[PDB]
Amino acid sequence: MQIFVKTLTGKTITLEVEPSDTIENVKAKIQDKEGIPPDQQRLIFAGKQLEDGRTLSDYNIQKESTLHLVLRLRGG
């Protein structure tokens, strides 16, 4: 299934994923496509940071959902 990711520059990219993909696998797919090292990637969906060892299915992330890449230091 195809999901979307908004990068730090505001660009929306597509990603081909499966519900069984872990978030760190999603980060690997983002690296493959956009070159962003997984260590730099932090992903938000439904207002919360996604955990690397959980799956898209765990978060009820479905086709056409949009994830957001965010800054590592974003608070205070």
């Binding site: 299934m1 195809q2 979307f4 730090l8 520059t9 505001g10 929306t12 990219i13 597509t14 081909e16 496509k33 938000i44 439904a46 207002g47 919360k48 940071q49 086709k63 056409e64 949009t66 800054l71 590592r72 230091l73 974003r74 608070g75 205070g76």
Partner: protein, 340 residues
């Protein structure tokens, strides 16, 4: 002598005290929090009980209110936790937790009633007759401010379409990969509108996380009907500014304060941890616009990063009176035994 008590400065929790005051003065939420059935909860671990405790103390204490039991309950006992997550992430963590605790109770659904709006995320193909409309909930809106004069321009940006082409073509089922546009449309705006202003951004030319201190204007009264797909003449989407969360600093730390007009009457107070003082409307609003880049003082780095608005037709419900009769006696007695 405002009648509003402050929160202790108990470390490097950044936006936390500001958020807690904003939520406390969301009176309908505060009342619902008091009704949560926390009798079975372990105090060390329970965010619901810890929020009851902080709110009870903000409502009754004449002295600054502590938060150590609260930060313990949600497991952010280091500056790093507050530096890595932003204010709306903490807000969502707290609200999701209390929403779950309210399921099956007399106040079930208070969080979505107050904070949840409805949008449609649409993908429209440009050269085949195919459109996918998906309903999405939202609990806050993240607004881009760089190059935007004001809230209107940021909303225009928010609803601007994204192009899906090149290596980012849309998977249009039987049509295969297709050039498309992707956007959002607002169906509803919630009674309490949290607008996060993106005051840090990635600068693509330098690979750096930079502070945006630019001027960004926000009004005390904000009309949003033109951003809805369908308006209601009896209930215009007119919003009243309730809170302005302010940060002083060019890095992700420094000084955090919140300005509130708890009653929605434009009589503002400044909440600076333990010190709560009356202030002018300009100190709450225009002084937090940003745009003092030539100024060598802290003014250059002091600006708003989150705004709270309340829909005018919902003000009386959101800011309804909260009385001691609204706090269950068993809860008061539990919290009083702990203070000992």
């Amino acid at each position: 002598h405002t009648g509003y008590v402050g929160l202790k400065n108990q470390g490097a929790t950044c936006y936390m005290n500001s958020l807690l005051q904003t939520l406390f003065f969301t009176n309908q939420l505060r009342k619902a929090v008091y009704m949560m059935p926390t009798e079975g909860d372990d105090s060390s671990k329970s965010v619901p009980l810890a929020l009851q405790r902080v709110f009870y103390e903000l409502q009754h204490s004449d002295k600054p209110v502590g938060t150590k039991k609260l930060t313990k309950s949600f497991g952010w006992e280091t500056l790093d936790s507050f530096m890595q997550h932003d204010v709306q992430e903490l807000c969502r963590k707290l609200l999701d937790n209390v929403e779950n605790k309210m399921k099956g109770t007399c106040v079930e659904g208070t969080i979505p009633k107050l904070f949840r709006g409805k949008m449609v995320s649409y993908i429209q193909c440009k050269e085949v007759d195919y459109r996918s409309d998906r309903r999405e909930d939202y609990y806050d809106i993240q607004l881009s401010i760089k190059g935007k004069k004001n809230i209107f321009e940021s909303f225009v940006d928010y609803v601007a379409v994204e192009q899906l082409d090149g290596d980012n073509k849309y998977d249009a089922g039987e049509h295969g990969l297709q050039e498309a546009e992707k956007g959002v449309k607002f169906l509803t705006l919630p009674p309490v509108l949290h607008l996060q202003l993106m005051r840090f951004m990635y600068d693509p030319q330098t690979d750096q996380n930079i502070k945006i201190n630019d001027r960004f204007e926000f009004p005390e009264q904000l009309p949003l009907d033109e951003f809805l797909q369908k308006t209601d003449p009896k209930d215009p989407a007119n919003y009243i500014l309730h809170a302005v969360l302010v940060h002083s600093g060019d890095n992700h730390g420094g000084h955090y304060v919140v300005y509130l007009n708890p009653k929605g009457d434009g009589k503002w107070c400044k909440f600076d941890d333990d010190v709560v003082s009356r202030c002018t409307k300009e100190e709450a609003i225009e002084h937090n616009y940003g745009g003092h880049d030539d100024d060598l003082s802290v003014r250059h780095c002091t600006n708003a990063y989150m705004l709270v608005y309340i829909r005018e037709s919902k003000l009386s419900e959101v800011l309804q009176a909260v009385t001691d009769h609204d706090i269950p006696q068993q809860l008061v007695e539990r919290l009083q035994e702990e203070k000992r």
